[PDB]
User: Which sequence fits this backbone?
């Protein structure tokens, strides 16, 4: 008489989220989301066609690193920050990731499946 029921879609710390608009718009780096769900080879985008994804401008990336990131793990210095992930940063809708994280994303995986 043991009730079995457990869902596990997210793994690890939550992906890096940041604010891009003064209106409270928060986005997350798809790279983090991908590793978070362990999806590679664009599996996240290919698996979630209805998921909002876009590239960040040089200015956006700069704000992304400073706003989203700070010191990060591994050997880091105070005089310098990060100039590796500033080559290409994929932003995603915080609400989209949150839903998938909450387990709601059927419309994201199948575009709409109305």
Assistant:
């Amino acid at each position: 008489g043991s009730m079995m029921m457990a869902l596990s879609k997210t793994f690890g710390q939550k992906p890096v989220k940041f604010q891009l608009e003064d209106d409270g718009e928060f986005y997350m780096i798809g790279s983090e989301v991908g590793n978070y769900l362990r999806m590679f080879r664009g599996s996240l985008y290919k698996r979630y066609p209805s998921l909002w994804r876009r590239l960040a401008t040089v200015e956006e990336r700069k704000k992304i690193v400073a706003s989203s990131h700070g010191k990060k793990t591994k050997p880091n210095t105070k005089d310098h920050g990060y100039t590796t992930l500033a080559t290409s940063v994929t932003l995603l809708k915080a609400s989209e990731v949150e839903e998938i994280l909450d387990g709601n994303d059927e419309k994201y995986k199948a575009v709409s499946i109305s």
User: Anything to note?
Assistant: The radius of gyration is 16 Å. Residues 58-68 form the longest helix (11 residues). Residues 47 and 109 are 5 Å apart (CA to CA).
